[PDB]
Amino acid sequence: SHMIKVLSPAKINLGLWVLGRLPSGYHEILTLYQEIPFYDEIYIREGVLRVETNIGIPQEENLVYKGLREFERITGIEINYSIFIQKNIPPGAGLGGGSSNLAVVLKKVNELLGSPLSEEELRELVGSISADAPFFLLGKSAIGRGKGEVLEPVETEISGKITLVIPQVSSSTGRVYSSLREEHFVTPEYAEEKIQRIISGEVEEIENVLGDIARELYPEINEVYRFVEYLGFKPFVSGSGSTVYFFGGASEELKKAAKMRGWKVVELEL
Numbered sequence: 598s599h600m601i602k603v604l605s606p607a608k609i610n611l612g613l614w615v616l617g618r619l620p621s622g623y624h625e626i627l628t629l630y631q632e633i634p635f636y637d638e639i640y641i642r643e644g645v646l647r648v649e650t651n652i653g654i655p656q657e658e659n660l661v662y663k664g665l666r667e668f669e670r671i672t673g674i675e676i677n678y679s680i681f682i683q684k685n686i687p688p689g690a691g692l693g694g695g696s697s698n699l700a701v702v703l704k705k706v707n708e709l710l711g712s713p714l715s716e717e718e719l720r721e722l723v724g725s726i727s728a729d730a731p732f733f734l735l736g737k738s739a740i741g742r743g744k745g746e747v748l749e750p751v752e753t754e755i756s757g758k759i760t761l762v763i764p765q766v767s768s769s770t771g772r773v774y775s776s777l778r779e780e781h782f783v784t785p786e787y788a789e790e791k792i793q794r795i796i797s798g799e800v801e802e803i804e805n806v807l808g809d810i811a812r813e814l815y816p817e818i819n820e821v822y823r824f825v826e827y828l829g830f831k832p833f834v835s836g837s838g839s840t841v842y843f844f845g846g847a848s849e850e851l852k853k854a855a856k857m858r859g860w861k862v863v864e865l866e867l
C-alpha cells in the first residue's frame with residue numbers, strides 16, 4: 598500500500614588499485630567510482646517486512662534485508678515495508694548492484710520513518726554490510742579509499758559513450774582477492790597519480806589488477822576482453838569482474854556476437 602518506486606543505479610570502477618592488507622584480512626584500495634545510468638527497479642510498499650527479487654535471491658542472503666534488520670536492531674523501530682527488486686544489474690558483474698540496492702532502500706526507508714538516522718549513521722550502517730554501499734548515497738563521481746567507503750566526490754572531464762559487455766559467468770570477489778599476490782600491490786602515491794590523470798579525462802590510464810586476475814580465473818571474461826580488443830577498442834574491467842567496458846558505441850558486429858554468447862550489452866552515455 599502507498600507504493601513508491603526508487604531507481605537503484607550501477608557503478609563502474611574507472612581504475613582500481615590494491616594498496617595493502619588490513620588487520621581484518623580485507624584489502625585497502627584506491628578506486629574511482631562512477632555512477633552509470635543502468636538501474637534496478639525497486640517497489641516499496643507498506644506491509645510485512647519482506648525483500649523479494651525477480652531472480653530468486655534468498656531473502657536471508659539479500660543485502661537489503663540484512664540492512665533493514667540491522668536498521669531495526671539499531672533504532673528499535675519496527676520496519677513495516679515490503680520491498681520488491683527487479684534485478685537488471687546482474688549479480689557478480691562487478692557493478693555493485695547489491696550495494697546500490699542496500700543504499701537506496703535504506704536512505705528512503707530512513708526518510709519515510711522521519712530520518713531517525715543521521716547521514717553519518719546511515720553511511721556507517723550500509724558500510725558495515727558492504728564497502729561499495731556508501732558510494733551510492735552520493736552517486737555521480739567519487740574517489741573511494743579504505744575499502745571504498747571513505748569517499749571524496751570529484752568532478753571528471755570524462756564524457757561520451759561507454760559500453761558494457763557483461764559475460765554470463767558470475768565473478769567471485771572473494772576468489773579474486775585470494776589469488777592476489779603481494780607483488781600486485783601498489784603505493785597510494787602511484788595510484789593517486791593514475792586517478793588524477795583519469796579524472797582529467799585520460800581514460801587510457803585506467804587499470805585494475807583484480808581484472809587481470811578475474812581474466813585468469815574466468816576464461817569467459819578474458820574472451821570478452823580479447824573480443825573488445827579485436828573490435829579495436831581498449832577494454833577495461835569493473836570491480837573484480839565480470840563486466841568489461843570500453844569507451845565507444847556498440848556495433849552490429851558486437852551485438853550479434855553478444856546474442857550468440859549471451860553477453861548483455863549496455864549502451865551508456867555520460
Ligand SMILES: Nc1ncnc2c1ncn2[C@@H]1O[C@H](COP(=O)(O)OP(=O)(O)O)[C@@H](O)[C@H]1O
Binds near residue numbers: 658660690693836
Ligand atoms: N539485492 C542484491 N542484489 C544483487 N546481489 C546481491 C543482493 N543481495 C546480496 N547479493 C549478493 O551479492 C552477489 C553479487 O554482488 P553484486 O553487488 O550484485 O555485484 P558485485 O559484487 O559483482 O559488484 C550475489 O552473488 C549475491 O549473493
Ligand SMILES: Nc1ccn([C@@H]2O[C@H](COP(=O)(O)OP(=O)(O)O)[C@@H](O)[C@H]2O)c(=O)n1
Binds near residue numbers: 625626727728772774
Ligand atoms: N576490499 C575488499 C573487499 C573484499 N575482500 C575479500 O573478498 C571477500 C568477499 O567480498 P564481499 O564484499 O563480496 O563479501 P563479504 O565477505 O564482504 O560479505 C571478502 O570476504 C574479503 O576476503 C577484500 O579482501 N578486500
Ligand SMILES: [Cl-]
Binds near residue numbers: 804832
Ligand atoms: Cl581495467
